[PDB]
Each structure stands twice: as structure tokens, then as C-alpha cells.
Ligand SMILES: Nc1ncnc2c1ncn2[C@@H]1O[C@H](COP(=O)(O)OC(=O)[C@@H](N)Cc2c[nH]c3ccccc23)[C@@H](O)[C@H]1O
């Protein structure tokens with residue numbers, strides 16, 4: 246059964262696109278794969294930010310992932326800094342990563358505020374993956390180059406020392422749910438959009454959801470019908486609704502037979518907020534139970550440590566370090 | 572508590588008399604005056620590709636060489652860098668408080684780039700940050716190094732102050748301790764070039780483990796100036812070779828440069844190099860006898876590593892906990 250590794254940014258403000266696409270997809274496959282979720286607080290500090298905000302966003306991310314259905318009895322979920330092997334393999338893999346490889350990274354694309362954490366975080370990301378003998382990494386478009394570096398480092402290291410690492414593969418199949426930006430239905434709804442009226446975050450209240458749905462773009466008589474060319478905005482709203490409800494697009498078209506665009510946005514907001522209401526309720530239950538979150542964090546980090554230490558011990562043996570006396 | 576000293580040497584290549592006069596001599600001399608912590612920085616060594624078997628054997632060589640020079644494990648903490656995970660952890664975090672320009676300006680990164688153009692790796696680039704992490708973990712007051720580490724040491728003071736100004740008095744700002752004499756021991760056949768472990772011209776280099784008979788031959792052929800008449804006078808600019816030999820003689824005997832200038836009044840360079848060779852031969856002969864007694868007792872080397880890494884970890888983990896609290900990390904549950 247394959248090992249799957251995902252990193253979760255504590256600063257990431259997740260959206261209904263993330264939840265109904267990737268997260269829903271992976272929540273349903275936790276018995277099919279050995280899923281590992283790593284909240285990457287070591288990657289976060291490559292962007293200077295308030296310390297207390299970062300502490301809180303780490304705990305918010307953990308509760309939010311648990312709210313969405315990550316089950317820590319099935320999956321391994323942990324905080325990156327709680328497992329020292331990441332930094333250790335991160336340093337070691339530096340020595341096997343070309344300087345040019347890092348400088349040709351587009352996500353790194355100065356000498357006045359580029360801290361070296363921003364420059365070197367692809368190697369840390371490689372270390373995150375290789376520690377766990379990872380077979381599959383679900384990567385978005387802007388993470389494809391980073392995944393390729395990981396495979397390049399792993400095969401380079403393996404060529405010198407043997408099958409120490411598994412070469413990770415991208416996880417190819419996409420969720421299927423189609424969620425696009427509210428004001429730009431040519432672009433996909435993205436958690437990292439600076440324009441937040443483009444997205445519906447998971448913790449938003451029904452009154453806020455009504456506001457952003459109500460300002461979702463539309464077209465001319467008017468008719469509710471799926472056409473990603475002529476009626477892209479209307480198509481996105483049918484896609485979100487179908488994503489929330491499970492109704493087919495042809496079914497939804499007959500539901501909105503003779504109804505107008507306001508009733509569609511009203512039905513979309515009602516369904517999205519309904520979904521977000523049970524999600525938020527679970528999120529607050531987990532988020533206010535400090536003993537619970539401590540227990541998940543402790544359990545997951547120990548599960549993760551067992552695998553990471555095995556790998557790092559193999560790396561150190563191969564490289565030629567004297568083993569730490571036991 | 573006494574002020575704290577920290578310093579490191581790589582288990583790569585063979586240590587030279589430059590390593591002795593620039594660092595190890597001062598390490599030994601400081602063990603009583605301060606609380607001294609000495610590291611074998613194997614994570615720094617792999618920035619230059621090593622044969623794995625050699626790296627492991629070289630690590631135990633370096634430890635025995637520390638012991639043979641008088642580093643005393645009952646007085647100093649001695650440990651191998653990779654046995655203390657906190658070095659890597661703080662190394663990562665301090666990358667975020669180091670600018671890219673500071674690292675691309677580094678002379679060591681430029682020189683090592685030209686020497687190892689087939690392996691210009693990111694560890695070579697990031698080298699100063701892990702070095703800073705080594706130093707700042709132990710609340711270090713003093714770092715005894717040769718002249719060639721001075722730029723590295725200044726970055727770690729700058730990273731220390733930068734972090735502290737954000738977060739409070741988390742790190743001590745360290746200070747260099749660089750010797751007045753013997754901080755940049757020069758090459759024997761080329762005294763305008765520093766003596767380097769990695770020199771292809773091995774007649775330039777005095778190795779601490781080299782056969783004394785071969786060291787004597789090399790010293791007697793050291794190049795000297797063409798003053799007429801020849802005078803044994805200390806002048807590093809205009810008398811590079813002669814001054815380098817005086818530096819080396821003084822590191823073996825403990826006599827001052829002026830007490831050596833008087834000793835060699837009315838003396839010529841042949842006599843000078845013969846005395847240097849004789850004194851260097853004797854010191855290496857006694858060092859190598861101690862070295863073999865320590866080196867062949869690998870169970871004693873293992874015990875030193877175990878006790879040292881445990882002593883190091885108690886300090887390093889205390890600093891790292893404070894760094895993690897300050898930057899905003901959720902603390903690992905107990
Ligand atoms: N010709 C010379 N004359 C005088 N001194 C010399 C000469 N050649 C070398 N040295 C000094 O020897 C020490 C060890 O050198 P390394 O190359 O192992 O040195 C190095 O590679 C360090 N980066 C190891 C290190 C890693 N982390 C640290 C933290 C604190 C202090 C030191 C370290 C150094 O003090 C070096 O200046």
C-alpha cells in the first residue's frame with residue numbers, strides 16, 4: 246500500500262475549492278493509501294510574520310484538516326518542526342543539490358530581501374518527501390518543478406549509494422470538482438489569491454457567503470444552462486452547486502427551468518453555507534480542545550518519527566557519518 | 572558559569588600545522604580559562620564530496636588528533652556535529668534570517684566554487700548558516716579560529732544581532748579569537764599563499780600526521796627571501812617565508828617572535844630552517860605517539876563521542892527551544 250505525502254501550509258487559508266476538490270478526494274482514500282499530512286511550519290518562516298500568528302495558524306490548520314475528515318487513526322498528521330529529521334535530511338540533501346538547480350527554480354524567482362530560506366526551501370521540501378519513502382505526492386501546477394527536483398535528488402543520491410530513497414511520483418488523477426474564481430470564472434478558485442472576493446474560505450459565515458455569491462459574475466434572455474464559453478460564470482455556479490449537492494448538471498438545469506440568476510445564486514449560497522456550517526461546527530470542537538490537539542500532534546509526530554529516523558539512519562550510514570552511539 | 576568557547580574542524584583531508592597554529596593550539600590553551608566546546612563538523616565536510624568509508628575513518632582520526640593535541644574530554648565538550656540534531660534544526664531556521672547576498676559574497680564559497688566546479692552544491696552555498704547555527708546554539712562568547720574563518724564568524728554575529736533585535740536576548744553575540752601570530756600559516760614553497768589541506772603541491776603543506784622525516788625535508792626547502800645580507804627578521808610583508816618559519820618555530824617552542832629574532836642574530840636562513848625542522852620534527856613525533864594511543868582505542872573514542880554529544884545536547888536543546896518559542900512554533904508535546 247503506497248505512501249502519500251502532502252504538506253499543509255499553516256498560513257494557507259483554505260477554500261471550498263480545496264475542500265471539494267483535493268481534500269474531499271483524499272479524505273475518501275485514507276484506507277487505500279498510507280496518507281501523511283505535514284503542517285510545514287519550517288517552510289512558513291521563510292516569510293517573516295508575527296510569531297503568535299504563526300503559532301495560532303499551526304493549530305488552526307490542524308483543527309481545520311481534522312474538521313475536513315483527516316482521521317489521525319488512519320492517517321499520519323503532524324507538525325514539521327516536531328520531527329527534527331526533516332531539518333537533518335534537509336541539510337544533507339543540500340550537499341547533493343546543485344546550486345544552479347536552486348537558482349533555476351521559478352518559485353524562487355534578489356540580494357536585499359531574499360533570505361536563504363526562500364532560496365533553499367526546495368531542498369527542505371525534497372527532504373520532507375524522501376524521509377517517508379513516499380510513493381505519491383499530490384502536487385499542484387506550481388509544485389511540479391519542486392517534485393521534479395525531489396526525484397532528481399533521490400535518483401542522484403541513489404546512484405551513488407543504492408536504493409536509500411523511493412523515487413516519488415506525482416499523483417495524477419484530479420478530484421473532478423470544478424470550482425472557479427467568483428469574479429474570474431476563467432481562473433480556478435485559489436487559496437493564494439490576493440483578491441479575496443474571488444474565493445469562499447471555509448470559516449466564512451453565511452452572511453459573508455451571500456455577499457460574495459451575490460457579486461459572482463453572470464451574463465445576459467437569461468437562462469440557467471451549462472456553457473463554459475458563453476455562460477462561464479453561470480457554469481461555475483452550477484458546478485459549485487453540483488459539487489455541494491451531488492445533483493447532476495442536467496438535473497440542475499431542469500431545477501432552474503424558468504428560474505432566474507438570482508435564484509441560482511441564492512441556491513448556491515444556501516448550499517455552500519449549509520456545507521460550511523457542519524464543517525465549522527467540527528472545526529470549533531477540535532480547535533477549542535487543546536488536550537485533543539496536543540494528543541494528535543504527539544501521536545502523529547511519533548508515527549512520523551519512526552519512519553523518518555529509519556530513513557535518516559540509512560542516509561547517514563551511506564554518506565559515511567559515524568553513527569551516534571546508542 | 573564561565574564564558575563559553577566553541578570551535579569546529581572538518582574531518583576532511585589531513586589536518587595541517589596551519590590548523591594547529593590557527594585553531595587547535597588556542598583550543599588547548601583555553602580549556603581552563605573558559606568552558607570549551609569542540610566539534611568535529613562532519614555535516615560541513617560533506618559539502619565537498621567524500622568517499623563514505625574515508626569520511627567515517629577521518630572522523631575518528633580527527634577526534635584522536637584533538638585528544639593527541641591535549642583537548643581533554645574531562646575539561647572540554649567534544650562531539651561530532653551530526654550526533655546533535657539541533658545543529659541542523661537551527662541551521663534551517665537561521666536560513667530565514669540570512670540574506671542571499673551575504674552568502675554569495677563569501678570568499679570561501681567563491682574559492683570552493685572554483686576548486687570544485689563539478690559540485691557547486693547548495694550546502695557549499697549555505698555553509699555559513701550552519702556554521703552560525705553551530706556557534707549560536709551554545710550561547711558562545713568566543714570562537715577561536717584562523718584568519719580564513721573571520722568572514723564566516725562576522726556573519727554569525729550579524730545573524731545573532733538581527734535575530735535578537737526581533738525577538739530578545741536569545742543569542743549571545745560571539746567574538747572572534749584569532750591569534751596575532753600563526754593566524755594564516757603560509758605555504759612552504761609559496762609563502763604568499765595560505766597553507767591548505769587540499770593543495771595538490773604537497774611540498775607546500777606540513778601535515779600533523781605526516782612522517783616527521785618528510786616534514787623535515789619539506790621545511791629545509793622552504794623558500795625564503797633574497798635579502799643581502801640574509802637576516803632572520805620578522806616581517807610578514809617583505810620577508811614572507813622567513814616570518815612564516817618564525818611563526819612555526821614560535822608555535823612549537825612557546826617563545827615570542829622577538830626572543831626568536833635575538834636567538835637568530837648573526838644567523839642565516841639555512842640554520843633557521845634547520846632549527847624549525849628540528850623543532851617541528853620533535854613536536855610531530857610526540858604528537859603522533861599520543862595520537863596512536865588514542866586512535867587505536869576505538870571504544871574510548873566511542874565513549875568520548877557519547878559523553879560529548881549528551882553534554883552538547885543539553886545546551887543545544889535549551890537554546891533551540893527558546894528559538895522555537897520566539898519565532899512562533901508550536902512546541903512538541905512532552
Ligand atoms: N593556514 C592556516 N593557518 C591558520 N589557521 C588555519 C589555516 N588553515 C586552516 N586554519 C584554521 O583551522 C580551523 C579548521 O579548519 P577547517 O577547514 O576544518 O575549518 C572549517 O571548515 C570551519 N568552517 C569549521 C567550522 C564549522 N562550524 C564552526 C563553528 C565555529 C568554528 C569553526 C567551525 C579553522 O579555524 C581555520 O581557520
Ligand SMILES: CC1(C)c2c[nH]c3cccc(c23)S[C@H]1C(=O)O
Nearest residue numbers: 250251252253254285370373388
Ligand atoms: C510548501 C508545500 C506545502 C510543501 C512542503 N513540503 C511538501 C512536501 C510535499 C508536497 C508539498 C510540500 S505541497 C507545497 C506547496 O507549495 O503547497
